[PDB]
Design a protein around this ligand. Sequence first.
Ligand code: MG
Ligand code: MG
Ligand code: MG
Ligand code: MG
Ligand code: MG
Ligand code: MG
Ligand code: MG
Ligand code: MG
Ligand code: ZN
Lengths: 98, 206, 134, 60, 155
Amino acid sequence: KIRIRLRAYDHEVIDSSARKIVDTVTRTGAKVAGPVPLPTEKNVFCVIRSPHKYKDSREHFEMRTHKRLIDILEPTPKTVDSLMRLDLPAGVDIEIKL
Amino acid sequence: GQKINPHGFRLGVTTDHKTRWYAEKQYAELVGEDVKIREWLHKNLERAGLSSIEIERRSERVTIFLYAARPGIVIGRNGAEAERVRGELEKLTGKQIQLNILEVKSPETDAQLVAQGIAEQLAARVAFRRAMRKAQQSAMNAGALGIRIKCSGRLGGAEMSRSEGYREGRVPLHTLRADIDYGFFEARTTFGRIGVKVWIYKGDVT
Amino acid sequence: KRPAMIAPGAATGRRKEAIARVRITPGSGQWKINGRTLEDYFPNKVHQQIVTEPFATAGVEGAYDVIARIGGGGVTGQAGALRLGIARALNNVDPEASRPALKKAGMLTRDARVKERKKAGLKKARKAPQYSKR
Amino acid sequence: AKTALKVKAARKPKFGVRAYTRCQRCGRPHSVYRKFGLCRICLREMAHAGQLPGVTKSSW
Amino acid sequence: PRKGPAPKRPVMVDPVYGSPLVSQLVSKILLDGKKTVAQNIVYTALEGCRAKNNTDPVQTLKRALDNIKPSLEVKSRRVGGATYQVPVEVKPARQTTLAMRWLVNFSRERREKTMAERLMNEILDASNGLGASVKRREDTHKMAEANRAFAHYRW
RNA sequence: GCUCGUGUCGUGAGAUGUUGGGUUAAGUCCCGCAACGAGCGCAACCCUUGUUCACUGUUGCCAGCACGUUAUGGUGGGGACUCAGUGGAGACCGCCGGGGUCAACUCGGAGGAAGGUGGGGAUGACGUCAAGUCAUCAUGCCCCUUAUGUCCAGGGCUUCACGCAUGCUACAAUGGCUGGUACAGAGAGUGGCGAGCCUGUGAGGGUGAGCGAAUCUCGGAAAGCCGGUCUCAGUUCGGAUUGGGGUCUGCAACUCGACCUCAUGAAGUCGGAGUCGCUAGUAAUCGCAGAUCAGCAACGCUGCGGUGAAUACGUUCCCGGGGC
Ligand SMILES: [Mg+2]
Ligand SMILES: [Mg+2]
Ligand SMILES: [Mg+2]
Ligand SMILES: [Mg+2]
Ligand SMILES: [Mg+2]
Ligand SMILES: [Mg+2]
Ligand SMILES: [Mg+2]
Ligand SMILES: [Mg+2]
Ligand SMILES: [Zn+2]
């Protein structure tokens, strides 16, 4: 019941946000499933290092998306208001499935 | 010619990204507006001296941290210049901009402002050796553990290009735990432009 | 010197990107890997020896049943993972009578040999494009 | 790139198939990534400077 | 290499015949990385061997290998302005390797249709004392004897 | 490896440090020493892989428990196993023995998933080549300004007596064809990935769920194994070329797209002098995925796993480099 999907690029801020969510809902009772980590999206970009005629030397980059999942077993409309009104860091987004 | 950018090398390890937002269907357009914001701010606020522009987004609302040595230019008189630059920012982007301007505690220790000053002196036609020595001495008076400055180009208005450099202390570029601040600027002279690069070893971090 | 102990047990095995969940139990010595029998899942004697020989080098012999759940990798990698899993199961069942010989045979060890990654400017992990001077 | 080419690429094409990408910072028409616009050089330099969130060097 | 003698990978034994020789034979056939194909060929050849003679196929393979094993072979030497063919004694491992390589190559060169019993025919002929492999062993020994005068250049 | 501060030597450029002995992958350390120090490089810190623990348990997993349409962990449920991903542990010549004047190191052994840097990546010192890029961007000066700006249609960048280079497919039987049947990893997806059903020889078309995705789709892995068949034939090898009939994308496939199908069936019998890659999960081969991208000339590139070798006596010779 009540899904919370957290996505960001830094696992430190992911973990901090998940801890804040779970400690908030708990402060409002509502027992909630622990933050379960989904597989991290791993996009890879290869780029010719030089601006011209040098293809054998290249640079690789990744955009790792870290995802965590929270279940709010207890309905608790007070926790509903809390989870819609609290503030989260800009780097992480929130997805609430009612 | 073959050296990596220190900031990119230490990105994620010790230093952090200048932009903090998440978006997976608009990523390109947010990148474009960020580029527009940064170009506009750099082109219209040279006088203040920009260490960094840090961009955050929550929901169609953008937040700009402007790390400047002298925010007097940015704030103008009683925030008039701050209001006008914010208004130009809404005009440029179309979103709600919350702009805040922060000091740099040690401008003589921040590499980007050091490159700013060295390039300004070179443009004002100060002897490059004297400028580099002054910047180096000021950095070590502040208390940096290592300075390295390199000016490349038609130094002194000459014809051939040189790559004159100064350094003392320790600047371990190869060490990832080493906190190395990197700055770069271009002195626009009557003879092309001079590239000034500055590495400053702040210390060691975990 | 003692003929070890029969005793149930379980372990896990891994080799070349292949995972082997092994559960060894007293029995007749028959096999069932992913439901199908040994002669079905490892259809040929090419690499049945590599999975049977843990018992041969242990005191117990083909009078001791095993159930295997195998995932990932190819046939040989799965064989190696299953062998390591059985070796570890025998280890943690009887760590005194089968441990010395079982480790000496180089079987309580997981070889980290994994496919080396491809590298930019090279056709494969180490193969290089044909150099052509002038 | 040429300014006329940049504005022509920006404007809606006559036929849908005639559109193309262009580096949104640079104007470069080759090697433009759909994920974040930009181009080869623009991606490399901006990722090094740290304006692209989530993008870091990969050394797996 | 400069640093020193690189370690040798241990040779495994054939599960069926219980001899490292057959494993070395399959690893020498072993074209394209197809171990199963190579040892299907090898097992078929050995079974054909035991079919045509009652003796053990591993024993007949061993006898063929001893009949193809070279004792000494000549190598090029850059002494002076002309090249020499210095005869050098061959260690047991090197000579087993040479015998296996020659067996496999001449089996591949034989005129019969299929590789399996091309190799079977070559093995039987070598064990008897005939064939291209034995001929090459005799020729290399003959040329070593011809150039035997340079046994003092060994280092 | 390249240097510096101070000292010292020399009229001076300069030298010493940085030579010597030993060692190391390493200017890595050790010993002695007119040197005493420091800095950039080496190493380590980072990423990934190999062992293990704690925490969490869905979209992942199913050992014990209860049904499921027969059936599908489908179900309640479970923290065991696997895995996912956060935080820890683990390797340090740390222990034992020998060598090593000792000392650095070195050899052997035990423990251990791993032993002497465990494998791989990121990382490229002072500088060299007036090396490449004014065409990614930026810019000094010079030049164009009813044109060297700029818009458009058509053409060209795809030409072809030739030469070189990098690849692909081959020349077959360790193979071709055909039926059946196993085992992956890493990735991508809403103008997208598209299942299922119907239709067509097929490319495809028509309907069309599901999935912003550990859920749904791409999906089939191929090599391999097993049965049948071909029987050494320029072939049931090879698939170039050429003729016919099509499909799809696109405003539009003539120049100049991919694909399907029918027919055609070229050179090629293992390649001269010469030359290239590779020391292990490597070479060899086998398929898969992605970027760009309406489509695609992609056999390219960057990755991914499957199968999986032979050999290294040695430094004499060839090429490149290091100390004196
Ligand atoms: Mg070249
Ligand atoms: Mg296009
Ligand atoms: Mg290093
Ligand atoms: Mg030039
Ligand atoms: Mg110009
Ligand atoms: Mg062309
Ligand atoms: Mg996605
Ligand atoms: Mg090597
Ligand atoms: Zn660009």
